[PDB]
Design an enzyme around this catalytic site. Structure first.
Site, PDB file in Angstrom:
ATOM      1  N   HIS B 201       0.815  -1.209   0.000  1.00  0.00           N
ATOM      2  CA  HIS B 201       0.000   0.000   0.000  1.00  0.00           C
ATOM      3  C   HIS B 201       0.852   1.264   0.000  1.00  0.00           C
ATOM      4  O   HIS B 201       0.334   2.358  -0.244  1.00  0.00           O
ATOM      5  CB  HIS B 201      -0.954  -0.025   1.196  1.00  0.00           C
ATOM      6  CG  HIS B 201      -2.070  -1.015   1.055  1.00  0.00           C
ATOM      7  ND1 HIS B 201      -2.156  -1.894  -0.005  1.00  0.00           N
ATOM      8  CD2 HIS B 201      -3.144  -1.267   1.838  1.00  0.00           C
ATOM      9  CE1 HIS B 201      -3.235  -2.642   0.132  1.00  0.00           C
ATOM     10  NE2 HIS B 201      -3.853  -2.282   1.242  1.00  0.00           N
ATOM     11  N   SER B 205      -0.972  -0.882  -6.168  1.00  0.00           N
ATOM     12  CA  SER B 205      -0.800  -1.962  -7.123  1.00  0.00           C
ATOM     13  C   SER B 205      -0.173  -1.476  -8.425  1.00  0.00           C
ATOM     14  O   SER B 205      -0.411  -0.355  -8.883  1.00  0.00           O
ATOM     15  CB  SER B 205      -2.139  -2.631  -7.433  1.00  0.00           C
ATOM     16  OG  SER B 205      -2.630  -3.348  -6.316  1.00  0.00           O
ATOM     17  N   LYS B 227     -15.349  -7.483  -7.465  1.00  0.00           N
ATOM     18  CA  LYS B 227     -14.551  -8.319  -8.356  1.00  0.00           C
ATOM     19  C   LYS B 227     -13.829  -9.427  -7.589  1.00  0.00           C
ATOM     20  O   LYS B 227     -13.759 -10.571  -8.055  1.00  0.00           O
ATOM     21  CB  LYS B 227     -13.566  -7.450  -9.134  1.00  0.00           C
ATOM     22  CG  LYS B 227     -12.830  -8.187 -10.225  1.00  0.00           C
ATOM     23  CD  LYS B 227     -12.058  -7.249 -11.126  1.00  0.00           C
ATOM     24  CE  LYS B 227     -11.307  -8.033 -12.188  1.00  0.00           C
ATOM     25  NZ  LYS B 227     -10.458  -7.168 -13.045  1.00  0.00           N
ATOM     26  N   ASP B 228     -13.296  -9.112  -6.402  1.00  0.00           N
ATOM     27  CA  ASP B 228     -12.641 -10.116  -5.575  1.00  0.00           C
ATOM     28  C   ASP B 228     -13.640 -11.124  -5.023  1.00  0.00           C
ATOM     29  O   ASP B 228     -13.291 -12.291  -4.832  1.00  0.00           O
ATOM     30  CB  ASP B 228     -11.880  -9.432  -4.434  1.00  0.00           C
ATOM     31  CG  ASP B 228     -10.592  -8.758  -4.897  1.00  0.00           C
ATOM     32  OD1 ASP B 228     -10.252  -8.849  -6.095  1.00  0.00           O
ATOM     33  OD2 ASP B 228      -9.922  -8.129  -4.055  1.00  0.00           O
ATOM     34  N   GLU B 271       4.292 -33.893  -2.572  1.00  0.00           N
ATOM     35  CA  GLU B 271       3.091 -33.370  -3.171  1.00  0.00           C
ATOM     36  C   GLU B 271       3.414 -32.674  -4.486  1.00  0.00           C
ATOM     37  O   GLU B 271       4.566 -32.342  -4.786  1.00  0.00           O
ATOM     38  CB  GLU B 271       2.427 -32.406  -2.198  1.00  0.00           C
ATOM     39  CG  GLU B 271       1.900 -33.085  -0.944  1.00  0.00           C
ATOM     40  CD  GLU B 271       1.077 -34.327  -1.226  1.00  0.00           C
ATOM     41  OE1 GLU B 271       1.658 -35.359  -1.619  1.00  0.00           O
ATOM     42  OE2 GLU B 271      -0.159 -34.269  -1.083  1.00  0.00           O
TER      43      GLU B 271
HETATM   44  C1  HEM Z   1       0.681 -15.686   2.034  1.00  0.00           C
HETATM   45  C2  HEM Z   1       0.486 -15.598   0.724  1.00  0.00           C
HETATM   46  C3  HEM Z   1       0.273 -14.292   0.073  1.00  0.00           C
HETATM   47  C4  HEM Z   1      -0.774 -13.441   0.261  1.00  0.00           C
HETATM   48  C5  HEM Z   1      -1.952 -13.631   1.183  1.00  0.00           C
HETATM   49  C6  HEM Z   1      -0.549 -12.320  -0.575  1.00  0.00           C
HETATM   50  C7  HEM Z   1      -1.456 -11.260  -0.621  1.00  0.00           C
HETATM   51  C8  HEM Z   1      -1.350 -10.260  -1.562  1.00  0.00           C
HETATM   52  C9  HEM Z   1      -2.382  -9.369  -1.902  1.00  0.00           C
HETATM   53  C10 HEM Z   1      -3.764  -9.341  -1.300  1.00  0.00           C
HETATM   54  C11 HEM Z   1      -1.909  -8.543  -2.867  1.00  0.00           C
HETATM   55  C12 HEM Z   1      -2.668  -7.421  -3.528  1.00  0.00           C
HETATM   56  C13 HEM Z   1      -3.589  -7.941  -4.631  1.00  0.00           C
HETATM   57  C14 HEM Z   1      -2.805  -8.425  -5.822  1.00  0.00           C
HETATM   58  O1  HEM Z   1      -2.145  -7.631  -6.521  1.00  0.00           O
HETATM   59  O2  HEM Z   1      -2.821  -9.631  -6.125  1.00  0.00           O
HETATM   60  C15 HEM Z   1      -0.576  -8.916  -3.130  1.00  0.00           C
HETATM   61  C16 HEM Z   1       0.231  -8.287  -4.048  1.00  0.00           C
HETATM   62  C17 HEM Z   1       1.524  -8.729  -4.284  1.00  0.00           C
HETATM   63  N1  HEM Z   1       2.131  -9.832  -3.814  1.00  0.00           N
HETATM   64 FE1  HEM Z   1       1.376 -11.085  -2.643  1.00  0.00          FE
HETATM   65  N2  HEM Z   1       0.589 -12.475  -1.266  1.00  0.00           N
HETATM   66  C18 HEM Z   1       1.156 -13.644  -0.926  1.00  0.00           C
HETATM   67  C19 HEM Z   1       2.342 -14.221  -1.385  1.00  0.00           C
HETATM   68  C20 HEM Z   1       3.200 -13.577  -2.270  1.00  0.00           C
HETATM   69  C21 HEM Z   1       4.278 -14.166  -2.945  1.00  0.00           C
HETATM   70  C22 HEM Z   1       4.704 -15.607  -2.819  1.00  0.00           C
HETATM   71  C23 HEM Z   1       4.869 -13.185  -3.730  1.00  0.00           C
HETATM   72  C24 HEM Z   1       6.038 -13.323  -4.627  1.00  0.00           C
HETATM   73  C25 HEM Z   1       7.245 -13.671  -4.194  1.00  0.00           C
HETATM   74  C26 HEM Z   1       4.122 -11.996  -3.524  1.00  0.00           C
HETATM   75  C27 HEM Z   1       4.384 -10.792  -4.122  1.00  0.00           C
HETATM   76  C28 HEM Z   1       3.378  -9.846  -4.308  1.00  0.00           C
HETATM   77  C29 HEM Z   1       3.590  -8.687  -5.175  1.00  0.00           C
HETATM   78  C30 HEM Z   1       4.853  -8.352  -5.925  1.00  0.00           C
HETATM   79  C31 HEM Z   1       2.443  -7.989  -5.153  1.00  0.00           C
HETATM   80  C32 HEM Z   1       2.143  -6.712  -5.892  1.00  0.00           C
HETATM   81  C33 HEM Z   1       1.609  -7.107  -7.267  1.00  0.00           C
HETATM   82  C34 HEM Z   1       1.222  -5.922  -8.108  1.00  0.00           C
HETATM   83  O3  HEM Z   1       0.632  -4.947  -7.603  1.00  0.00           O
HETATM   84  O4  HEM Z   1       1.480  -5.928  -9.330  1.00  0.00           O
HETATM   85  N3  HEM Z   1       3.101 -12.270  -2.654  1.00  0.00           N
HETATM   86  N4  HEM Z   1      -0.249  -9.985  -2.330  1.00  0.00           N
END
Ligand code: HEM
Ligand SMILES: CCCCCCCCCCCCCCCCCC(=O)OC[C@H](COP(=O)([O-])OCC(O)COP(=O)([O-])OC[C@@H](COC(=O)CCCCCCCCCCCCCCCCC)OC(=O)CCCCCCCCCCCCCCCCC)OC(=O)CCCCCCCCCCCCCCCCC
Ligand SMILES: CCCCCCCCCCCCCCCCCC(=O)OC[C@H](COP(=O)([O-])OCC(O)COP(=O)([O-])OC[C@@H](COC(=O)CCCCCCCCCCCCCCCCC)OC(=O)CCCCCCCCCCCCCCCCC)OC(=O)CCCCCCCCCCCCCCCCC
Ligand SMILES: CCCCCCCCCCCCCCCCCC(=O)OC[C@H](COP(=O)(O)OCCN)OC(=O)CCCCCCCCCCCCCCCCC
Ligand SMILES: CCCCCCCCCCCCCCCCCC(=O)OC[C@H](COP(=O)(O)OCCN)OC(=O)CCCCCCCCCCCCCCCCC
Ligand SMILES: CCCCCCCCCCCCCCCCCC(=O)OC[C@H](COP(=O)(O)OCCN)OC(=O)CCCCCCCCCCCCCCCCC
Ligand SMILES: CCCCCCCCCCCCCCCCCC(=O)OC[C@H](COP(=O)(O)OCCN)OC(=O)CCCCCCCCCCCCCCCCC
Ligand code: HEC
Ligand code: HEM
Lengths: 237, 379, 65, 55, 56, 74
Positions: B201, B205, B227-228, B271
């Site tokens: 934040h 995004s 949408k979500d 798995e």
């Molecule tokens: C516990 C698991 C995870 C949760 C709950 C989580 C949750 C979120 C959420 C809610 C967002 C904002 C919505 C979206 O853009 O999809 C987000 C964005 C992001 N997450 Fe995750 N995430 C997780 C794991 C990861 C992993 C494994 C990575 C990569 C190594 C990661 C990297 C990012 C990045 C880079 C963004 C920004 C994407 C963008 O705005 O283009 N996250 N995450």
């Protein structure tokens, strides 16, 4: 590696339930053929009520067995008629007596045998019906039997099923393939006793999704129409 | 007067995170998988806690406790296979989420990308330790192979493997401590996800064009909450299709057999969501080199911002790097398939070429190809 | 008493996949028995024959059961 | 306004149904399981106990 | 129209909207379960315990 | 980062309709189907060939592996 064929079971379909008369005949097959060497640790008599037997029929089936019951006032263990809450009797006190009685092989518990095999009831059906003579060049030690579906094709279980191996209460000929199909249906229920409920819930879920997904999609698109029909103009000085 | 949604200290945080958050107006369905991940997490905490109301971590009762859950607990089979297939859905969503980050250059958000790497590791550890808990054949022998991998570590491998076991092998102490870690870890994952969203934040995004979208921000609430919600309903559909129509599709029959330390299964595979790594480690003959490759295949995600050589952020306007990205996805699919297969001809040479290609793409081909694209655009 | 499986097996053995595999199997059986001491075995040939026969039998057997 | 809002009402109705089922099941898993209902529930018997006999 | 009447009577106020949703949830649960069950027992007719119990 | 202080923007007019004045699925097929086909031609040669290669590699590896378990006369 001889993989089992796919047989057209009554329960293969996506909403298709088990035929419960086959489950009842298959309990009769297990309780009269398999149980002398296989246990079903996780299936009790009560589990068969509302499935293939009435509570009175299942209480009499539990009465047919004697089960050991805990220490008396004097501290001895005794034998009592079975109960609905009692699990299926074990043929052998421990694994070592099971292996001693079966030429070194422990006959498995059948509560999960369909789930614990690749190919499931198809595999069990083909195994039970698949005893042939060993091919030319194949020799098995005594007490071993050629079965092309068993890994290694040398199984320590002699062919258990044959024509008229038991009698069926509803009068079916007890041909070997009939007995195998019945027992395989019972084993599918013993592995997955939520099968019919699971599929009824699946039908309800598919209906609810077919209603909600169009509706939530319409909600999303009603809110988004503001953005999606939006027009932009650029009027620089 | 005030709007308590904006003035109240708790409601202010909630308002700034999910209501009045400015979000890009063009983020696609691929931006849904964040909200799916956090939903999967909640589902795993919900069903697992209800599993933990009946499960017992003594090796004399764990397999029996799970059979009792699925056979006698009311709707316990629902909770159990919802939990197992929700772990599978968690990993599907994680892989799609990281793939989106790679494709659109979301790793340029350094802090939230690095926290995401931490989250990937912690989810993997949680799923690994959870799979041992039923104490089936696969539970036991997968724990055995994966923990004895750590003996490859120089000078302290045996000592650390035995300390993790609490004994000379995988046994009762290992199962009980794995239950404790499996219980605690998802809450640390929750905290890390909160930190993750805090770091995200800070900038907001990224979007599919890779261009800053501040001139076209829309409020989060009406648009991306709905949408979500639609994305969550679709995810629930897939999850319930798995749970109610093929409960055992993504599992293994040998875990319906209680663990037998005397007999080993003919095939000992993790798995599915570990197979790509299990392939890479199995490609290298050297024990320690194999473990180092199995770790580098996930640590290499930390290198993506330093490997970025394109003038553009995302892959939307770079056909050649899209080609390489889809080759990377295909190589990950072939690594998963190879890891599900025996170590014999021809899967060995295929796994070797795939394992080489994964690193050759990320570390070499993708940077050089971005530079070539840069010059094709005359910058 | 007669079993459905017997007659279904004969009818499905009348299948040309089965017909070809059966004489492949009987040429293996003619070799391995002629050669006095070998490592073969005709399990692969029998596996081909049984795969064909049992595919047909799985198509037709449950109708009489 | 009717048509649009009808879509919301129906949607909520469907969600309500779904929500209830999910919650109900999670509530019933904390209810006495089948085996508990089987063993501790009853121990009925007939007059098999004779007169003056404390079975 | 019918939908104009529905909105004017039952949808305009949120309390009455919610009451309509609650009553509809009750009646929908009843009717949807009845229909889905009948479909499931027609697909699986004669195979279930209920269909065959009356012989035992 | 809040609405009201994100950027400077000038001379941009936006026209929008109420959701109750417009439809949620206008030309959903007459326009949606050509758009899906356009979006498919735009990307298909970037996405598909790697998966064709995987199909071929998988097919070859599986058939070859099973071609090794066969008895070679010897
Ligand atoms: C516990 C698991 C995870 C949760 C709950 C989580 C949750 C979120 C959420 C809610 C967002 C904002 C919505 C979206 O853009 O999809 C987000 C964005 C992001 N997450 Fe995750 N995430 C997780 C794991 C990861 C992993 C494994 C990575 C990569 C190594 C990661 C990297 C990012 C990045 C880079 C963004 C920004 C994407 C963008 O705005 O283009 N996250 N995450
Ligand atoms: C007609 C030919 C066959 C179907 C289309 C084949 C194809 O490659 O279409 C690509 C094409 C998308 O190309 P694109 O617009 O460059 O991709 C933008 C993103 O896909 C994001 O676009 P979006 O946010 O509008 O959502 C579409 C997205 C939605 O993806 C998801 O929801 C996640 C799917 C994985 C889980 O799915 C896809 O684009 C790929 C297909 C997913 C499975 C079906 O897909 C569509 O036009 C949408 C789906 C249409 C299905 C019919
Ligand atoms: C593990 C998986 C877990 C679940 C993943 C869920 C991902 C997010 C799904 C929900 C979401 O936000 O979807 C937004 C996404 C886009 O919303 P939209 O308002 O339809 O966007 C229209 C485009 O602006 C422009 O659309 P267009 O004009 O290119 O095509 C219009 C229409 C035309 O389609 C037809 O006419 C089909 C004819 C056959 O096709 C669609 O709108 C595709 C919807 C079904 C796919 O909706 C879908 O993709 C609906 C299906 C979602 C499930 C995945 C399908 C792939
Ligand atoms: C989350 C939302 C998922 C989408 C909605 C699916 C709803 C499907 C549904 O509720 O079907 C009914 C089914 C229970 O069916 P049944 O046991 O026959 O009881 C019917 C009432 N007597 O109930 C179910 O199938 C419920 C399955 C989902 C349970 C977990 C939901 C997430 C927590
Ligand atoms: C994720 C979502 C988290 C919850 C959302 C938090 C913010 C909204 C909740 C508070 C709210 O809606 O308050 C509005 C209102 C108070 O009075 P009002 O004059 O309507 O509004 C002034 C302050 N907004 O509230 C009321 O008047 C409440 C009336 C009784 C409840 C019905
Ligand atoms: C996916 C199948 C559909 C597909 O490939 O569609 C292509 C489409 C193109 O999207 P666009 O953002 O317009 O990219 C520029 C195109 N000229 O869409 C894309 O290219 C977007 C796909 C990449 C980003 C979203 C996440 C995809 C994850 C794939 C699996 C990842 C597995 C783990 C990888 C690490
Ligand atoms: C595929 C996408 C659509 C999913 C199925 C429909 C979901 C519910 C949407 C709805 O109520 O109507 C959809 C369709 C077109 O409706 P729409 O364009 O939203 O508005 C027309 C009237 N103003 O109208 C209809 O289907 C008939 C509505 C009455
Ligand atoms: C008198 C002995 C005996 C009888 C009768 C018997 N079994 Fe077994 N069974 C065994 C032994 C011993 C094994 C161990 C296999 C070896 O290896 C075994 C193994 C099995 C297996 C496992 C094969 C595998 O893939 O591991 C199945 C399934 C099975 N039996 C089912 C049955 C069914 C169904 C019946 C009767 C309707 C039956 N058995 C009757 C002794 C018996
Ligand atoms: C990060 C989220 C979580 C993941 C990814 C996860 C993953 C898993 C997996 C894969 C299994 C094995 C399922 C199987 O039997 O096939 C499992 C089992 C289990 N998990 Fe979790 N889990 C999570 C959270 C939790 C939490 C928070 C708890 C406790 C509150 C929990 C309790 C259990 C229990 C009791 C089992 C054993 C019962 C069973 O095998 O189904 N889980 N977990």
């Amino acid at each position: 590696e001889l993989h089992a064929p796919s047989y057209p079971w009554s329960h293969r379909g996506l909403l298709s339930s088990l035929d419960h008369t086959s489950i009842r005949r298959g309990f009769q097959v297990y309780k009269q053929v398999c149980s002398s060497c296989h246990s079903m640790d996780y299936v009790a008599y009560r589990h068969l009520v509302g499935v293939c037997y009435t509570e009175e029929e299942a209480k009499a089936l539990a009465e047919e067995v004697e089960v050991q019951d805990g220490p008396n006032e004097d501290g001895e263990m005794f034998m009592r008629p079975g109960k609905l809450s009692d699990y299926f009797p074990k043929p052998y006190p421990n694994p070592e007596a099971a292996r001693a009685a079966n030429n070194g092989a422990l006959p498995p518990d059948l509560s999960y045998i369909v789930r614990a095999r690749h190919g499931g009831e198809d595999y069990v059906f083909s195994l039970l019906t698949g005893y042939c003579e060993p091919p030319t060049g194949v020799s098995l030690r005594e007490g071993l039997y050629f079965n092309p579906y068993f890994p290694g094709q040398a199984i320590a279980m002699a062919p258990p099923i044959y024509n008229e191996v038991l009698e069926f209460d509803d009068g079916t000929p007890a041909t070997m393939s009939q007995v195998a199909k019945d027992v395989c249906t019972f084993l599918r229920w013993a592995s997955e006793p939520e099968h019919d409920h699971r599929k009824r819930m699946g039908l309800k879920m598919l209906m609810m999704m077919g209603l909600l997904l169009p509706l939530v999609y319409a909600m999303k698109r009603h809110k988004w129409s503001v953005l999606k029909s939006r027009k932009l103009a650029y009027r620089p000085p | 007067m005030t709007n308590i949604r904006k003035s109240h200290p708790l409601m202010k945080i909630i308002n700034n995170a999910f209501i009045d958050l400015p979000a890009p107006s063009n983020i696609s369905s691929w931006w849904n998988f964040g909200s799916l991940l956090g939903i999967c997490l909640i589902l795993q905490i919900l069903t697992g806690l209800f599993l933990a109301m009946h499960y017992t971590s003594d090796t004399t009762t764990a397999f029996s406790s799970v059979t009792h859950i699925c056979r006698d607990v009311n709707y316990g089979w629902v909770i159990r296979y919802l939990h197992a297939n929700g772990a599978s859905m968690f990993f599907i969503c994680l892989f799609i989420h990281v793939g989106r980050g790679l494709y659109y250059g979301s790793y340029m958000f350094l802090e939230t990308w690095n926290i995401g790497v931490v989250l990937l590791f912690t989810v993997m550890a949680t799923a690994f330790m959870g799979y041992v808990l039923p104490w089936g054949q696969m539970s036991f022998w997968g724990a055995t192979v994966i923990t004895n991998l750590l003996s490859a570590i120089p000078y302290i491998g045996t000592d650390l493997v035995e300390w993790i076991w609490g004994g000379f092998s995988v046994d009762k102490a290992t199962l009980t401590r794995f239950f404790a870690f499996h219980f605690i870890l998802p809450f640390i994952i929750t905290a890390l996800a909160a930190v993750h969203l805090l770091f995200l934040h800070e900038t907001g995004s990224n979007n599919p064009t890779g261009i800053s979208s501040d001139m076209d921000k829309i409020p989060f609430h009406p648009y991306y909450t709905i949408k979500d919600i639609l994305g969550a309903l679709f995810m629930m559909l897939i999850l319930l299709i798995l749970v109610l129509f093929s409960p055992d599709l993504l599992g293994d029959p040998d875990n319906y057999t209680p663990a037998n330390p005397l007999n080993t299964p003919p095939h000992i595979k993790p798995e599915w969501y570990f197979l790509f790594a299990y392939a890479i480690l199995r490609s290298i003959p050297n024990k320690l080199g194999g473990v180092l490759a199995l770790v580098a295949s996930i640590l290499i995600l930390i290198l993506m911002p330093m490997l970025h050589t394109s003038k553009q952020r995302s892959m939307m306007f770079r056909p050649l790097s899209q080609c390489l990205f889809w080759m990377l996805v295909a190589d990950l699919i072939t690594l998963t398939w190879i890891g599900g297969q025996p170590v014999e001809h021809p899967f060995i040479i295929i796994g070797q070429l795939a394992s080489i290609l994964y690193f050759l793409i990320i570390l070499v081909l993708m940077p050089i190809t971005s530079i070539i694209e840069n010059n094709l655009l005359k910058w | 008493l007669v079993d459905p499986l017997t007659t279904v097996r004969e009818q499905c053995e009348q299948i040309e996949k089965c017909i070809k595999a059966r004489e492949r199997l009987e040429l293996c059986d003619q070799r391995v028995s002629s050669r006095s001491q070998t490592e073969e075995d005709c399990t692969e040939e029998l596996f081909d024959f049984l795969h064909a026969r049992d595919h047909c039998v799985a198509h037709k057997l449950f109708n009489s059961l | 306004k009717g048509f649009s809002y009808l879509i919301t009402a129906t949607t909520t109705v469907g969600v309500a149904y779904a929500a209830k089922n999910a919650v109900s099941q999670f509530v019933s898993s904390m209810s006495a399981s089948a085996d508990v209902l089987a063993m501790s529930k009853i121990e009925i018997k007939l007059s098999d106990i004779p007169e003056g006999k404390n079975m | 129209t019918l939908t104009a009447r529905l909105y004017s009577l039952l949808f305009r106020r949120t309390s009455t909207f919610a009451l309509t949703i609650a009553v509809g949830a009750l009646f929908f649960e009843r009717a949807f379960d009845q229909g889905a069950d009948a479909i499931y027992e027609h697909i699986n007719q004669g195979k279930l315990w209920k269909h065959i119990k009356h012989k035992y | 980062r809040e609405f009201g202080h994100l950027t400077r923007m000038r001379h941009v007019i936006t026209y929008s309709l109420s959701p109750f004045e417009q439809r949620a699925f206008p030309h959903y097929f007459t326009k949606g189907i050509p758009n899906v086909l356009r979006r498919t031609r735009a990307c298909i040669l970037r996405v598909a060939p790697p998966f064709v290669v995987f199909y071929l590699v998988y097919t070859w590896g599986t058939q070859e592996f099973e071609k090794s378990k066969r008895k070679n006369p010897a």
